[PDB]
Design a protein around this ligand. Structure first.
Ligand SMILES: N[C@H](CCC(=O)O)C(=O)O
Ligand SMILES: N[C@H](CCC(=O)O)C(=O)O
Lengths: 254, 254
């Protein structure tokens, strides 16, 4: 299939990375809305409209499946996009719920959901987890991780202080942490290192990566063999400067 | 007299606050492009197009003067906006140069410009300063101040760590710090405090507030009577959820 990948900006490169490593698709058209990014600090009406405009972008490109790599667009706009599309649209929330069902059999394990403000206020993850019977779920909007990560603050005292800022109030020590944002895989080890240090743990909590979860969902749903497509055609498109977005792709994808 | 104030979002309330305090205008139409904020991390082509589109927003409003409160749009889009406009457009860069001309007679005084990445990259402040003979000029993009301030992080260790991140390499004590971004007034005293601590001063550098500069500039250019309009009509418009933007106004204007 010819696939589209939509994100608000460059964050979706963490999903594209998972897709590319799996070698499942031969043609991928990436579109990042880099003129208007971030979505996570904005309101549901604005985001829903952005999702619908992403469909208009892809319509002339005759894609067969659209991945919404953005957890924020997945949380707020996916249902409206799906109603307006004749092709399947797969977001990054449900695949992570499926991944949890498969990897977390104890329905009382403390799960911590991390995302943008918009993602967390939508309760998309809370509702879906409760529907599957999970009972011990906390959510946390770690808004400032996004701009720190885009400024390449992936280590150091600034990142640690920002983690302290958001994590210190936590009541429950999570056993599972959902990276419900495109950006957060880039600090996954730091988040693991946080909870091991400040809680004297031997093993980190289990982290759920949205890109890895959607690869697995897509392999199951569409019966897609891995390592089948070694030299895919990948095209990059952007609402802001595409050269800027391609330079970021080089960094995020290598 | 009926004016417009244009900003990427809510940062422009720092300028509106200055305008209201002066009580010189009767009718103010504020427009924040809150669907697309920020501008500071984006590219010149995009920002220029955002500026031209702002002119379209104000057409039905019959304004007689447009203030570009945004330092980023001022640095990148002002000239094109002015070329396409039948009304005067006033940005926040030139009024701050005038404030320096008037307050800083020693042309060798060291000046530090703070702003978004786009503002600093444009060199608009350095070029304007050179035009008046100020050649001892340094500049620093302090990108993360914008999202910190929008998250209401105006004090405490997270802000101090962020200031340390940007300021620790500074070796030249500035005599003047230009707050070349709508948001930076909300942490002005913290910036003053930092320099006093870091350079061991008994008195901080002089800070140039963009909003106060443009008010003074406008008072001189149009010979407006301060404290004339005590009960102005103020309208808020936004590309995102205007209720969200008005709520922020309440906080910023208090
Ligand atoms: N792509 C977004 C993060 C950046 C944004 O806020 O737009 C997400 O996955 O939530
Ligand atoms: N209003 C912008 C700050 C926020 C943004 O980057 O849009 C400025 O004055 O530079």
């Amino acid at each position: 299939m010819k696939i589209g990948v939509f994100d608000s900006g460059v964050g979706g490169f963490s999903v594209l990375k998972s897709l590319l490593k799996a070698q499942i698709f031969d043609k991928i058209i990436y579109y990042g809305d880099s003129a208007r990014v971030p979505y996570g600090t904005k309101d549901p009406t604005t985001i829903k409209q952005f999702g619908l405009e992403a469909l208009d972008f892809f319509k002339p490109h005759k894609i067969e499946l659209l991945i919404v790599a953005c957890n924020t667009a997945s949380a707020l706009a996916l249902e409206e996009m799906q109603k307006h599309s004749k092709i399947p649209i797969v977001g990054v929330i449900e695949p992570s719920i499926l991944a949890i069902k498969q990897q977390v059999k104890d329905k009382n394990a403390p799960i911590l959901v991390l995302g943008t403000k918009a993602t967390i206020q939508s309760n998309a993850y809370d509702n879906a987890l409760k529907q599957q019977g999970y009972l011990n779920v906390s959510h946390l909007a770690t808004s400032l991780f996004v701009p720190l990560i885009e400024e390449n603050i992936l280590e150091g005292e600034l990142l640690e202080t920002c983690m302290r800022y958001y994590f210190t109030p936590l009541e429950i020590l999570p056993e599972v942490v959902i990276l419900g944002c495109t950006h957060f895989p880039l600090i996954a080890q730091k988040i693991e290192g946080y909870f091991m240090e400040h809680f004297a743990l031997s093993t980190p909590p289990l982290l759920i990566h949205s890109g890895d979860a959607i690869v697995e969902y897509l392999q199951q749903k569409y019966t897609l063999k891995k390592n089948a497509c070694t030299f895919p055609k990948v095209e990059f498109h952007a609402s802001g400067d595409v050269v800027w977005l391609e330079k970021q792709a080089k960094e995020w994808l290598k």
